[PDB]
Design a protein around this ligand. Structure first.
Ligand code: CHL
Ligand code: CHL
Ligand code: CHL
Ligand code: CHL
Ligand code: CHL
Ligand code: CHL
Ligand code: CHL
Ligand code: CHL
Ligand code: CHL
Ligand SMILES: CC1=C(/C=C/C(C)=C/C=C/C(C)=C/C=C/C=C(C)/C=C/C=C(C)/C=C/C2=C(C)CCCC2(C)C)C(C)(C)CCC1
Lengths: 31, 75, 33, 732, 60, 163, 41, 122, 20, 80
């Protein structure tokens, strides 16, 4: 049974939030 | 330079001698198409006599690629 | 696969658009005085 | 002038291109940064560890998501022996139409890559069945990675910044890690296996929505609390059990059957559950050893101080070693990398012979890939362990604080250690190469009966003592009236002796003289790599050629052409030399693994037995013979699915060759060439309008050694990975 | 300290540490390293002599 | 190790037959009494004698029909394989100790001369021949020097790098 | 004659003579006793 | 000191170089960028049209090559823009002058790509 | 719990950890 | 710039100063050795790091020591 498009968009949004947190940690480690 | 010329002449004289003594040059002269030139014969020890291959002319030895046979025939 | 148009957008984005911006910004950063 | 290396003022004032390269290359050496304190160093390391954990969890989430979205996991679940698992989809606009059809492989998912990581077998074994389960796991792991990123950001805040004494609390960290990070996690994995994975192997569907009402055992937790624990070992899966179905399935959850599941050719899941339960109990017990804040437990300083032999053989013993280990992060990193790399090698040696995942032993490409991957990882990690030992000796070692203990005493007889390592390496190399060359000359002269074929009787004796009856030694597990035989006869010896006396698996393969010769080659590689690394670590502080080497640091180019010449005299250079020998050693190891298993998988065991005793046999019958399909991945007549591996094969050869340039040609040639080029740019009209900000210079000596080593290693790995995957895949 | 007397070098960074050399001369003007020692072996620079202080040489 | 004696191994006999057959196939292109014929006949005789000697020596053969050596001193002594590795081990160790002791004695003798480096590249051939002949009795002198403490230099007399 | 014998005592000439003797001894042993694999008679 | 040659020090060579838009006496840097972009962006479409992956398809070949040339022009305009922000931290050798030069390069390059497309269509 | 579990093994038929 | 240090084992033989290609070193008066002079390194901003001075030094171990440090235009030997 294949995934749905909404599931992929949900995963992309969660990964975008994770990327925002990654940028925050990278800035905090830099300075 | 004289020493180098002497060494080169020793090398050339050895090449002519091995053609005279340890070669199938006369048989190759009689049949230059089906006989492989050979002028090096190895001694039978530690199994190395397998290198004396069946080059033709009723002769066994290492096949040579220096072209001396063709040079000697041309001379 | 579901949302099969996504590779045709994301592969040019990750492969071309993101590295161009990344090298431009990093070049501007390492040349800053 | 510039501000990119903000952690190094000396690099920031460099007017050349060396500032960019060295700024990249020294970014994570936090101790050498400007105005760094110990506390801020530990806090930065803590946050970086959080970032690495987040990267790992995101990588696992990506693997899960791409398999769930573009793979064929349910189709592979239905037919695990006849379906190639899909890694991810291919979208390449440079592809031609035959490339599109070749990578489609007659399927409907478009161009795909066939996975070699073995994630399908692992995820199937642990109970995942559908794409929904993999997608949920990927979402959960992405959330976990975000949580670890936030935790890394949070503990850099001043309120949540841990103090230096918190980082140095060895007893509390050891107690907590042993009891919870190992023991409790192992207990929870036992819980997952008992509640989910074992029922899924028996055709029962257990997920979050019904696991609270599903009994893992029919009798419940009553046999556990009543102390009658043998109930959970009763009625195991029969030999006719089909994995993932209820046919032939038992009800046991914790067994000790041993051997393999007959259908999956893998370890029993109930054995795995009992293993992790016992591991959990042992590790939870081990985490109650060290004194924290409850008045009971051991102090590691007292343990180290007490262990000095009274005869004075070890001098002061281990006195002062607590402060040496605890204050030096490079000592801890070296110990951690040594143990982790040894464990990685153990993982490689145990997953091929005792495969833990269902239908993994039948996937030959996956087994070869996993072994080669983990052995090369272990080699790199061992090299790093010795490198950080050398860094500890240069940077952190205090001779006065370690007066007379085992560290100073092993420094005090380093010449004996290095010379004995040199002797054993020379002996192994001389005699292994001589035996191989003797056998090669015997095969060349047409007399293979004159070969020196030493039987490996010691390892065969070990195999006989573990139950292999083929060699005719009658002892222990191959002796039926022995105590060792009778003790395990009712517990695990039936399955173990079934598996070890079967030649259809990889459990304790039959060995002969070729195995002897290649094992001694492996010993030569290990001993020589150790000799280079150990000599680099022990001469890191100084030698007769450079008695003040500690004043110059771990990495420096040389000491100049004086005193005879001092090229590659630093301990970093010893690491750089040893990476070549490690690559050679792991190459020999993986060559042996792949060729012996290729002969076993093709049904022709005699090919390895009759050709591995001489090196021409290795070349012709392993490299030349098995590269025929790989190099025909694309030809004038067309292409097939192996064309990506042929291209990567050539790619790795090219990268390997490019590294030879950085390793053979050295700096001063290139600096003069770049000087002429810089003249040419300034004198060329229409191009002197533009100008450089950083003055172009040749790469530094150490940087060149690093770049050449990186190209060499990348070409080595890419070439062998392409050859291994193509040669195993094209026949199986 | 004497003339042509065997001495053992105690300087750890010296090439001839724990080795025996012959005293060439001892300077008497109060310089830092007055003892001149000749060795039968050359170091990595090809030098066969070095100067040592009083505490760096032990008579053997 | 599950091996069979080469005198009763079918692979050993098959290998002898195949090698003799290949040499005889090479033999039939030459006339009798010629030099290649005599050389090939001598090779055939050497092959037969070698296979007979390997069978008569008690060598063990694997499934490949090739002799396998036994190097454990226990299995070699109780099953008649000591001539494969153990006796060669004793012979090599004796000759190697001979060479090492002769070299050590020459170095020690040259150490006492006015130009010790001169004897290292211009060999004192009579002295080297005398010392070389005296290396037959090396184990007695070496074991005595080990017991006396004169074999080893003291650690205080050997240079080391700073630690 | 003293100078000539000193030249023959130099390390490469001595090495040539010694290795010629050793190689010849090994060759003639393998000629008189062909194919020695084990210490068996 | 500096070696002078007829290649470097001819009246004809210095005359030819002075008439180039990069060396003309008084020209605004935006206009120099405009001529340089027109000439270069006209030229780069040729290899893209005649040798690109769609070169054997009539009609699509010219469009694909001109789009590739426009993409190359955009990339080079970005490279010129980030060059000026670094090199400048002669009105051309200034930050604002190089900004105008980059804008003129982009405008001229797009114009040259469009003119090459028109010429191939006519 | 070691005593009760080892007793449960030695009382269950078919299992014998003894070396004789 | 590179760091050049002179240790008190210097015998004042002036060989390091004569070997220097960028005039980093000079001899100053001293009393710790027989030659009544010691080497000094007042101009280490011009030191390229060639270590010709260490090759010229006869003492064991070296009396002149060069420690390579931060690189400038002068220390990288750049004419451009
Ligand atoms: C380039 C010069 C050159 C080379 C490479 C060879 C090479 C060879 N020669 Mg030829 N020779 C050469 C020049 C000459 N050779 C000869 C006359 C001979 C003869 C008569 C023989 C060789 C033999 C050999 C072979 C074995 C030699 C040996 O084992 O020494 C042995 C090494 C020693 C140290 C002993 C030397 C004793 C000698 C009395 C002094 C070898 C292939 C043999 C042959 O070819 O195989 C059947 C052989 O019988 N050479 C003459 C005329 C004098 C030369 C000039
Ligand atoms: C993942 C990265 C990546 C992607 C998605 C592509 C995609 C493409 N490449 Mg490949 N490239 C990529 C990395 C690399 N490329 C190459 C080397 C080449 C070469 C040598 C060629 C390609 C060409 C192509 C095209 C082939 C399809 C076609 O038929 O064109 C049909 C094309 C069109 C119909 C017109 C396309 C116009 C294009 C979309 C304009 C793009 C403008 C930019 C996005 C502007 C960027 C501004 C900012 C963001 C920097 C396609 C656009 C071929 C070509 O077609 O392009 C010149 C070509 O000759 N690539 C290298 C060097 C190793 C890379 C690294
Ligand atoms: C006869 C009685 C007796 C024996 C046999 C031992 C035996 C030992 N005690 Mg002692 N003890 C004994 C009485 C008592 N001990 C102690 C108290 C202690 C303490 C407190 C300690 C010992 C330790 C030791 C060990 C090391 C001692 C030593 O000096 O190592 C000398 C070691 C060397 C000189 C180095 C040798 C290195 C070797 C040559 C390296 C070789 C490497 C290989 C070449 C490479 C690998 C090859 C491959 C094939 C493996 C050793 C096992 C120590 C220990 O290890 O505990 C476990 C220790 O801390 N004992 C008490 C009072 C309670 C005794 C009464
Ligand atoms: C958990 C493990 C671990 C940790 C925390 C560290 C931490 C550290 N290391 Mg150790 N290392 C570790 C494992 C290993 N180390 C080493 C060997 C070394 C050495 C020899 C040195 C360190 C140094 C350092 C420090 C500085 C790191 C740096 O600046 O990176 C900079 C990172 C780079 C410049 C990365 C570039 C190299 C990389 C291989 C590129 C790979 C690219 C691929 C070839 C591309 C392939 C795909 C292509 C084809 C598309 C830092 C304390 C240095 C030191 O402590 O200071 C004196 C130092 O000299 N490490 C190896 C063997 C490879 C390991 C495995
Ligand atoms: C095939 C390639 C190769 C070979 C044969 C060697 C050989 C050796 N390495 Mg070298 N290396 C090689 C590639 C590389 N290595 C290194 C880096 C190192 C390091 C850093 C070290 C070595 C050491 C060693 C020795 C290992 C001990 C041993 O095996 O003794 C057996 C010796 C051999 C196998 C050498 C060959 C012997 C020869 C066949 C004998 C016969 C000679 C002929 C009769 C002479 C004929 C002369 C002609 C003119 C008539 C050995 C001398 C280690 C060592 O020096 O200490 C023990 C050491 O520390 N290697 C790099 C990276 C730079 C390589 C690429
Ligand atoms: C590397 C060292 C080494 C190893 C791993 C072995 C291994 C073995 N030896 Mg051997 N040996 C070894 C060196 C030596 N051994 C011997 C003398 C013997 C004898 C006399 C015997 C063995 C026997 C054995 C076997 C059973 C030994 C045992 O512990 O039974 C528990 C086993 C195959 C036995 C046998 O031959 O096979 C069963 C036996 O009787 N060894 C000597 C001479 C002192 C050695 C040096
Ligand atoms: C007098 C001769 C002599 C003796 C007694 C030794 C003794 C030793 N060597 Mg040294 N060596 C000797 C000559 C030479 N060695 C070496 C190079 C080495 C290395 C690189 C190593 C040793 C090591 C060792 C030790 C271990 C045994 C071994 O590894 O053998 C191996 C010996 C060789 C590989 C060279 C042997 C060449 C030849 C057979 C010996 C020389 C013969 C003399 C020319 C004879 C002259 C006598 C005449 C004039 C009467 C042992 C202390 C190892 C170590 O230190 O162990 C702790 C080690 O790693 N040797 C060279 C340069 C090739 C030599 C010439
Ligand atoms: C120095 C090493 C050396 C030793 C110990 C011997 C030993 C021997 N050779 Mg030999 N040879 C040796 C080098 C050489 N030989 C020969 C050529 C011969 C010949 C032609 C003969 C011997 C014969 C003999 C034997 C009687 C003399 C004896 C076994 C004779 C023989 O084989 O038995 C009587 C004999 O006829 N040698 C050459 C030239 C290639 C050598 C170099
Ligand atoms: C360390 C590696 C090594 C070892 C252990 C051997 C061992 C052996 N080789 Mg092999 N070889 C080795 C490396 C190499 N071999 C060869 C090429 C050959 C050949 C071509 C032959 C051998 C043969 C032999 C045997 C010689 C026995 C003998 O002459 O007794 C004589 C004993 C003495 C001289 C002792 C001294 C007594 C004293 C004079 C009184 C023996 C089994 C021969 C054999 O027939 O195969 C089994 C053979 O024909 N070797 C090459 C290439 C050059 C090598 C590298
Ligand atoms: C330099 C240095 C360093 C480093 C080091 C290293 C890197 C090392 C490594 C090491 C290693 C890498 C090791 C390993 C080892 C191992 C072992 C030691 C093992 C053992 C084992 C055993 C004991 C077992 C036994 C058994 C059993 C139990 C069962 C049966 C079988 C057998 C018998 C096998 C450090 C940091 C410290 C410090 C500084 C200096």
């Amino acid at each position: 049974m294949p995934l749905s498009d909404s599931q992929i968009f949900i995963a992309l949004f969660i990964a975008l939030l994770t990327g925002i947190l990654a940028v925050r940690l990278g800035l905090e480690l830099y300075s | 330079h004289f020493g180098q010329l002497g060494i080169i002449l020793i090398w050339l004289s050895g090449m002519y001698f091995h053609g005279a003594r340890f070669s199938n040059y006369e048989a190759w002269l009689s049949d230059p198409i089906h006989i492989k030139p050979s002028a090096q014969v190895v001694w039978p020890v530690v199994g190395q006599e397998i290198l004396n291959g069946d080059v033709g002319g009723g002769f066994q030895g290492v096949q040579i690629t220096s072209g001396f046979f063709q040079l000697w025939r041309a001379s | 696969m579901a949302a099969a148009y996504l590779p045709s957008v994301l592969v040019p984005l990750v492969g071309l658009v993101f590295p161009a911006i990344a090298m431009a910004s990093l070049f501007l950063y390492i040349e800053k005085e | 002038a510039t501000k990119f290396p903000k952690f190094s003022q000396g690099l920031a004032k460099d007017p050349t291109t060396r500032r960019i390269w060295y700024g990249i290359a020294t970014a994570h050496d936090f101790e050498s940064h400007d105005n760094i304190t110990e506390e801020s160093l530990y806090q930065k390391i803590f946050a970086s560890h959080f970032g690495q954990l987040a990267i790992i969890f995101l990588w696992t989430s990506g693997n899960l998501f791409h398999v769930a979205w573009q793979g064929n996991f349910p189709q592979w679940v239905q037919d695990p022996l006849h379906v190639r698992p899909i890694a991810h989809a291919i979208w390449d606009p440079h592809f031609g139409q035959p490339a599109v059809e070749a990578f489609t492989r007659g399927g409907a998912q478009g161009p795909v890559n066939i996975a070699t990581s073995g994630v399908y077998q692992w995820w199937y074994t642990i109970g995942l069945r559908t794409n929904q389960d993999l997608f949920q796991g990927s979402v959960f792991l992405t959330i976990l990675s975000g949580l670890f990123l936030f935790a890394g950001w949070l503990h850099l805040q001043p309120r949540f910044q841990p103090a230096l004494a918190w980082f140095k609390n060895a007893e509390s960290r050891l107690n907590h890690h042993l009891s919870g990070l190992f023991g409790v996690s192992s207990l929870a994995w036992t819980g997952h296996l008992v509640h989910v994975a074992i029922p899924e192997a028996r055709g029962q569907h257990v997920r979050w929505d019904n696991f609270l009402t599903t009994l893992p055992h029919p009798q419940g937790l009553a046999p556990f609390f009543s102390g009658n624990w043998a109930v959970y070992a009763q009625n195991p899966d029969s030999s006719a059990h089909l994995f993932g179905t209820g046919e032939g399935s038992g009800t046991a959850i914790l067994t000790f059957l041993g051997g393999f599941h007959p259908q999956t050719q893998s370890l029993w899941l109930t054995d795995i559950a009992h293993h992790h339960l016992a591991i959990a109990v042992v590790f939870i017990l081990a985490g109650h050893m060290y004194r924290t804040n409850f008045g009971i437990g051991h102090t590691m300083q007292e343990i180290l101080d007490a262990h000095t032999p009274p005869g004075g053989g070890l001098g002061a013993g281990h006195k002062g070693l607590f402060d040496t280990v605890n204050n030096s992060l490079h000592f801890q990193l070296g110990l951690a990398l040594a143990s982790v790399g040894t464990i990685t090698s153990l993982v490689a040696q145990h997953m091929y012979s005792l495969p833990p995942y269902a239908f993994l032993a039948q996937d030959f490409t996956t087994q070869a890939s996993l072994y080669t991957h983990h052995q090369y990882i272990a080699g790199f990690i061992l090299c790093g362990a010795f490198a950080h030992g050398a860094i500890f000796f240069v940077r952190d070692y205090d001779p006065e604080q370690n007066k007379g203990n085992v560290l100073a005493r092993i420094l005090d007889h380093k010449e004996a250690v290095i010379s004995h390592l040199s002797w054993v390496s020379l002996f192994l190399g001389f005699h292994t190469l001589g035996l191989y060359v003797h056998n090669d000359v015997m095969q060349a002269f047409g007399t293979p009966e004159k070969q020196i074929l030493i039987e490996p009787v010691f390892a065969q004796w070990i195999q006989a003592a573990q139950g292999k009856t083929l060699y005719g030694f009658d002892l222990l597990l191959s002796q039926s009236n022995s105590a060792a035989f009778s003790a395990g006869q009712t517990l695990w010896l039936p399955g173990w002796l079934d598996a070890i006396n079967s030649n259809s698996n990889s459990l304790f393969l039959t060995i002969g003289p070729g195995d002897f010769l290649v094992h001694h080659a492996i010993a030569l590689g290990l001993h020589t790599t150790t000799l280079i690394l150990v000599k680099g670590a022990l001469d890191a502080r100084g030698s007769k050629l450079m008695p003040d080497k500690k004043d110059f640091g771990y990495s420096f180019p040389c000491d100049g052409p004086g005193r005879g010449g001092t090229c590659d005299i630093s301990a970093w250079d010893a690491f750089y030399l040893a990476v070549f020998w490690m690559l050679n050693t792991i190459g020999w190891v993986t060559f042996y693994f792949h060729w012996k298993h290729l002969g076993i998988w093709q049904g022709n065991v005699n090919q390895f037995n009759e050709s591995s005793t001489y090196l021409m046999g290795w070349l012709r019958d392993y490299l030349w013979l098995n590269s025929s399909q790989l190099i025909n991945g694309y030809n004038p007549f067309g292409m097939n699915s192996l064309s990506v591996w042929a291209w990567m094969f050539l790619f790795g050869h090219l990268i390997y060759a490019t590294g030879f340039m950085f390793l053979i040609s050295w700096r001063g040639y290139w600096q003069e060439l770049i000087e002429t080029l810089a003249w040419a740019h300034e004198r060329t009209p229409l191009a002197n309008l533009v100008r450089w900000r950083d003055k172009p210079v040749a790469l530094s000596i150490v940087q060149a050694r690093l770049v050449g080593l990186a190209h060499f290693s990348a070409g080595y790995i890419l070439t062998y990975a392409a050859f291994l995957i193509a040669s195993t895949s094209g026949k199986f | 300290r004497l003339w042509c007397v065997q001495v053992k070098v105690l300087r750890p960074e010296s090439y001839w540490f724990n080795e025996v050399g012959k005293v060439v001369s001892v300077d008497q003007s109060g310089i830092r390293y007055p003892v001149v020692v000749r060795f039968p072996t050359v170091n990595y620079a090809g030098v066969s002599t070095n100067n040592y202080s009083l505490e760096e040489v032990q008579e053997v | 190790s599950g091996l069979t004696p080469c005198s009763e191994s079918k692979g050993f006999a098959k290998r002898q037959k195949n090698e003799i057959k290949a040499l005889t196939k090479r033999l039939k292109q030459y006339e009798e009494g010629s030099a290649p014929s005599l050389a090939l006949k001598a090779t055939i005789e050497r092959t037969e004698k070698r296979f007979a000697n390997y069978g008569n020596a008690g060598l063990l053969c694997g499934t490949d029909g090739l002799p396998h050596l036994i190097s454990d001193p226990g299995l070699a002594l109780r099953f008649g394989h000591a001539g494969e590795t153990l006796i060669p081990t004793v012979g090599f160790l004796y000759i190697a100790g001979w060479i090492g002791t002769a070299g050590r004695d020459y170095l020690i003798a040259s150490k006492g001369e006015a130009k010790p480096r001169e004897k290292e590249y211009i060999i004192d051939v009579p002295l080297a021949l005398k010392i070389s002949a005296q290396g037959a009795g090396w184990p007695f002198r070496v074991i005595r020097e080990l017991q006396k403490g004169t074999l080893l230099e003291k650690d205080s007399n050997i240079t080391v790098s700073p630690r | 004659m003293k100078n000539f014998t000193t030249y023959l005592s130099t390390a490469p000439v001595v090495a040539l003579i010694w290795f010629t003797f050793t190689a010849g001894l090994l060759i003639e042993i393998n000629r008189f006793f062909p194919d020695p694999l084990v210490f068996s008679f | 000191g500096m070696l002078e040659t007829p290649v470097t020090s001819s009246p004809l060579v210095a005359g030819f170089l002075s008439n180039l838009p990069a060396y003309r006496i008084g020209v605004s840097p935006l206009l120099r960028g405009v001529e340089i972009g027109l000439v270069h962006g006209f030229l780069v479409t040729g290899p893209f049209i005649k040798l690109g992956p769609l070169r054997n398809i009539p009609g699509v070949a010219e469009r694909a090559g001109c789009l590739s040339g426009a993409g190359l022009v955009v990339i080079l305009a970005v490279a010129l823009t980030i060059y000026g922000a670094s090199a400048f931290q002669d009105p051309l050798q200034t930050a604002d002058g190089w900004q105008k030069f980059s804008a003129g390069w982009l405008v001229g390059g797009l114009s040259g790509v469009a003119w090459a497309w028109i010429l191939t269509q006519t | 719990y070691f005593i009760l579990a080892t007793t449960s093994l030695n009382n269950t038929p078919g299992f014998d950890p003894k070396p004789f | 710039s590179h760091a050049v240090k002179i240790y008190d084992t210097c015998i004042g033989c002036t060989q390091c100063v004569r070997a220097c290609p960028t005039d980093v070193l000079e001899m100053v008066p001293w009393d710790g050795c027989k030659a009544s002079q010691i080497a000094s390194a007042p101009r280490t901003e011009d030191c390229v790091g060639c270590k010709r001075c260490e090759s010229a030094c006869p003492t064991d171990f070296l009396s002149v020591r060069v420690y390579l440090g931060s690189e400038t235009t002068r220390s990288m030997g750049l004419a451009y």
